[PDB]
Design a protein around this ligand. Structure first.
Ligand SMILES: [Ca+2]
Ligand SMILES: [Ca+2]
Ligand SMILES: [Ca+2]
Ligand SMILES: [Ca+2]
Lengths: 336, 334
DNA sequence: GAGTCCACCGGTGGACTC
DNA sequence: GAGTCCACCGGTGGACTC
């Protein structure tokens, strides 16, 4: 559970444990002795909890403490079963906390989209826990989908076939000239729900926890939307970074720039909204860094920021509020 | 020395040792038990050797093993003195290996520049170790300076003030609108030697090794050029990354684009040449990532980053730089 | 199981500032 | 001395394939 439980832990089958012992089962060019089983940790810690949609005590606690809870639980489990032999490299804890921050933050946003969507389809505004009611007039045409994008994704794949075609009658050209304009991915995208799915019920149901089945539902959702989104309909991109360092700032800034070149410059979409979320900005450098203007826009000839904001969520509840308020204002631009 | 030596290690003052024991003097908020004294390690391992300008055995040795030699010698010293107690985090070894990769390679380029400058001022071509003589016709106007840039630098501060004013007026315009266009830095910049300096012999002397003083001469040279470089005289920028991950590619790419926007768009420079050097590409993702066209170029076409280079040996890094000079300096009139 | 890729970030040694 | 900032990268869990 969210709060460690010796009983729930011993109730686990060996392959559901948060710490997997692989001493007598190594791995080429790795010295790992104990693996932190990310997906099991999530299931144990947030199996019945989605922060911001849970108890008062969890919805309002330091979001840093929430995100750090899975590792804390797993290290306790590791200590109990293995006492003195237990050992994991800080680089293991680093990788795992990053993924937890992204997966948990994306879950919060999934549930927001679901409450938002049911409102849009005339079902009223849920009230546990209680959040102020959006004042935008309901419309099925103003539903959205929250898409936690996978490793190796190319966001251009979300786009409707005619838009992807435009992008290629551009890059094929460059590439034949020994250049190119590759695209990777933000961590997450929020898109307007395609007309064809606007009466589909799955886009309105909140999840109760990050159980393995719900992990999959969430992590696989982008597949449903591939090839279906108009250029103007990518409404928000988010990059998560649990903590910042000065060198780790530029992938989001570079990708934001390429997205704006392609979407606004070549596809006539309005300003692309892209933001970065962190729990430890470790100073002020980052805030200034992210004030930079979009390059393509600049060099061509209104200019705006590449990155709209660096946001430091203090509690899961604030993350949810920020997203509800963003929707309440952004979707006004959708006819409905 | 480059090859570990029990005796040289024995003769080291406590403050010169490559492993500093700090179990009795903890850094606040840190668990560190032993520090890797990175400057000490460079003086121990490379105190009399600059790879590519030393023995043929070192020059033609795999560059990964040369770059890894310092940390290896330190771990040996650590084990000898503290046995089973010696413990450092991989993140420490990572930090120091990154800095050593960067420091040694720019030292190699520093000696290349020296040899190049000697030839440009009519002193002929040094021959040990052997390297092909450039075919470019010598001129004192074609000398260059090699600038290992410091942490927290802003490359804009290399430019003559008239040029700094154009940029600062531009970005002051932007800040008024709540925008910006900050500039950080590449690890290294090679620049045409300013006229005032074209007869100062310090730019033609090869260092024998990375002793502390030579470390400081090289790490401090950028200060001599601040405020003196014309926009078109920044000849090559280089970013060093010992290994690569798909996430750690974008700072050089981003900074290159900004350099081009500013130097080419705003200041009328020729193509800005910016390249990345690594010992471990880990696949072909990075080579494709770096074929990306300059965004400013499009907004108007050449790449942002000219090449991703994987030096196999120090000698090869030297050869490539000489060849670069032979071509790039044709744009400077003799 | 093994091989290969992808993208996560935290612990660092030294420079600067009082 | 002691406090802050900078920019270094290697060890990871899981996706995909057989
Ligand atoms: Ca993801
Ligand atoms: Ca991320
Ligand atoms: Ca440097
Ligand atoms: Ca570097």
């Amino acid at each position: 559970p969210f709060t460690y439980s010796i009983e729930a832990t011993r109730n686990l089958a060996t392959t559901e444990r948060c710490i997997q012992d692989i001493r007598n089962a190594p791995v080429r060019n790795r010295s790992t002795q104990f693996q932190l089983a990310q997906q099991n940790m999530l299931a144990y810690t947030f199996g019945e909890v989605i922060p911001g949609f849970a108890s008062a005590g969890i919805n309002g606690m330091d979001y840093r403490d929430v995100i750090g809870r899975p590792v804390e639980n797993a290290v306790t489990e590791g200590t109990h079963f293995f006492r003195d032999d237990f050992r994991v490299d800080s680089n293991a804890k680093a990788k795992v906390a990053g993924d937890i921050f992204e997966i948990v933050s994306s879950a919060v946003m999934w549930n927001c989209a679901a409450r938002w969507n049911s409102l849009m389809v005339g079902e009223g505004w849920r009230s546990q826990p209680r959040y102020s009611r959006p004042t935008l007039s309901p419309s099925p045409r103003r539903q959205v989908a929250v898409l936690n994008l996978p490793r190796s994704f190319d966001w251009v794949s979300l786009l409707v076939p005619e838009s992807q075609e435009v992008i290629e009658e551009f890059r094929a050209g460059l590439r034949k000239d020994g250049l190119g304009l590759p695209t990777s991915t933000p961590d997450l995208a929020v898109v307007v729900l395609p007309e064809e799915f606007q009466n589909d019920e799955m886009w309105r149901e909140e999840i109760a926890g990050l159980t393995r089945p719900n992990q999959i539902l969430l992590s696989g959702a982008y597949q449903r939307l591939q090839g279906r989104v108009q250029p103007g309909e990518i409404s928000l991109a988010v990059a998560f970074k649990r903590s910042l360092r000065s060198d780790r700032l530029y992938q989001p800034l570079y990708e934001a720039n390429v997205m704006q070149l392609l979407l606004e410059g070549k596809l006539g979409a309005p300003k692309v909204e892209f933001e970065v979320h962190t729990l430890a900005p470790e100073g002020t450098n980052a805030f200034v860094t992210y004030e930079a203007a979009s390059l393509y826009g600049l060099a061509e000839g209104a200019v705006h920021r590449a990155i709209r904001e660096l946001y430091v969520p203090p509690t899961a509840a604030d993350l949810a509020r920020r997203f509800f308020a963003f929707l309440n204002e952004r979707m006004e631009l959708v006819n409905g």
